[PDB]
Design a protein around this ligand. Structure first.
Ligand SMILES: [Mg+2]
Length: 463
RNA sequence: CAGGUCUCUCGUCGAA
RNA sequence: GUUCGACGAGAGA
């Protein structure tokens, strides 16, 4: 991913965008009860906490592009993954407009809670001014799409979230790319059935975890990944993708039955157009996180990428024994014979990908069921029923969440949600967590689920 | 007044 | 207590 050109939005016939400068995150009543290393991400150039240039920091992810062609490794990779997806019977027929907007099995309706993007954001128009779930009206929508058309610039916002102290100082905040309502709809029309099929089939045939429920899915993963484990991290995956990977995606979509008309949509992903504050800029390469389908297309590409690197590095290898599950850039995999991830990373580098040891380790170590994570969660066999596996989110990450709030009105819901994450750590850890919550006046006012209840509900989930 | 795509889950409500 | 629907929150990518 690379920024090709920047101009003033005025020059390009676009208004300056009002972009929020202040966090919603405030310290909670629990801020001093627990330890934590994270604060709200820098959102503006005049943050007291900066030790670096902010705008320089947030755009540094566009590391550049490699200019290479779709080589023989990619081709075989695409053919192999296309071979799996053919079993699923993905329809390339457009999704009915009502389903695409207001939801159908395997595909939830648009989010009317979120901004409608350009041009609406500068017209003072909201998604709910245009759509309504109670009524399912398409009238007003078709009119806005005919009026403003397709391929609108995406609007860049800084993501309001917790980040480590280090990333605060270095101004390393994350960016999101708001997709225009029109383009979201158009995307969902064209690729909705693929979206649905993926959401209905998390596992090793889609090669995707999108649509999984970790409480249930974790027990299935070791059965599907029965070989020697493969795992590693990427740095700035999305922004690091060079156009050649998008060429790969277009090719696999074609093998699924898609027409050049439809794979043309990917061109507007790869070669994208953005508004940030008062600037209009064009990016070549990079998945613009926030466009419709970012999760699924990122996962599909991840599936191409890993196969490619395997075939490049181990010439001769049999992919039919290979298994992988991606969520965007997050990946867990297995092969019956050992694989040196550090070599895959070196091949990665040549393709413009930055691959590091899993979970920010500093050497590419053996990946074990003991130390492998996925969706920030460890794997732990139940002591009683060893075929059931606990998704174990680190108490320290749970601690980071509880120390902040965007609205103390939500304290009950917030803490209860964390309890459903925490209990998988064990009765002892849970109770300690419950105690510290009760060690403070607001804590003693909350209704908190008992361990035994959580365990019972979970066990019941498998019946 | 402004802050994406999505998945899962919890909670409140409410219809047969 | 199921299934379904609308709202809010949390987490993950
Ligand atoms: Mg990972």
């Amino acid at each position: 991913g690379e920024i090709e050109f920047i101009e003033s939005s005025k020059d390009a016939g676009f208004p300056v965008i009002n972009t929020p400068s202040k966090t919603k995150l405030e310290p909670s009543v629990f801020h001093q009860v627990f330890e934590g290393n994270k604060e709200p991400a820098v959102l503006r150039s005049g943050d007291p906490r900066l030790k670096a240039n902010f705008e320089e920091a947030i755009f540094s992810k566009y590391i550049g592009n490699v200019n290479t062609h779709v080589d023989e490794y990619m081709l075989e990779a695409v053919d192999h993954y296309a071979g799996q997806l053919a079993t699923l019977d993905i329809s390339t027929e457009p999704m009915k407009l009502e389903d695409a907007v207001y939801g159908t099995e395997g595909l939830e309706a648009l989010d009317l809670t979120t901004s409608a993007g350009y041009p609406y954001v500068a017209l003072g128009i909201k998604k709910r001014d245009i759509l309504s779930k109670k009524t399912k009206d398409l009238t007003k929508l078709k009119e806005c799409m005919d009026k403003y058309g397709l391929n609108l610039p995406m609007v860049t916002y800084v993501k309001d979230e917790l980040r480590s102290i280090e990333k605060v100082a270095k101004g390393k905040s994350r960016l999101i790319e708001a997709s225009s309502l029109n383009d979201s709809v158009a995307m969902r029309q064209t690729f909705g059935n693929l979206y649905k099929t993926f959401h209905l089939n998390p596992g090793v045939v889609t090669g995707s975890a999108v649509g999984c429920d970790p409480d249930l899915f974790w027990s299935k993963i070791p059965v599907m990944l029965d070989g020697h484990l493969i795992a590693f991290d990427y740095s700035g995956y999305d922004a690091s993708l060079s156009p050649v990977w998008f060429a790969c995606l277009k090719m696999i979509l074609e093998k699924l039955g898609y027409t050049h008309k439809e794979t043309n949509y990917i061109d507007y992903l790869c070669n994208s157009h953005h508004l940030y504050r008062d600037k209009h800029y064009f990016v070549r390469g990079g998945m613009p996180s926030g466009c419709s389908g970012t999760s699924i297309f990122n996962s599909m590409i991840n599936n191409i990428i890993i196969r490619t690197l395997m075939l490049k590095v181990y010439k001769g290898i049999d992919l039919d024994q290979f298994r992988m599950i991606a969520y965007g850039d997050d990946v867990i995999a297995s092969y019956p014979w050992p694989i040196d991830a550090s070599l895959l990373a070196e091949a990665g580098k040549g393709y413009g990908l930055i691959m590091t040891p899993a979970d920010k380790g500093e050497c590419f170590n053996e990946v074990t069921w003991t130390n492998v994570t996925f969706l920030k969660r460890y794997f732990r066999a139940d002591e009683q029923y060893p075929f059931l596996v606990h998704p174990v989110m680190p108490m320290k990450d749970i601690h980071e969440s509880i120390r902040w709030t965007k609205d103390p009105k939500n304290t009950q819901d917030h803490v209860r949600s964390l309890c459903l994450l925490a209990w998988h750590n064990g009765e002892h850890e849970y109770e300690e967590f419950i105690r510290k919550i009760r060690s403070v006046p607001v804590g003693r006012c909350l209704t908190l689920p008992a361990f035994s209840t959580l365990r019972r509900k979970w066990l019941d989930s498998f019946g």
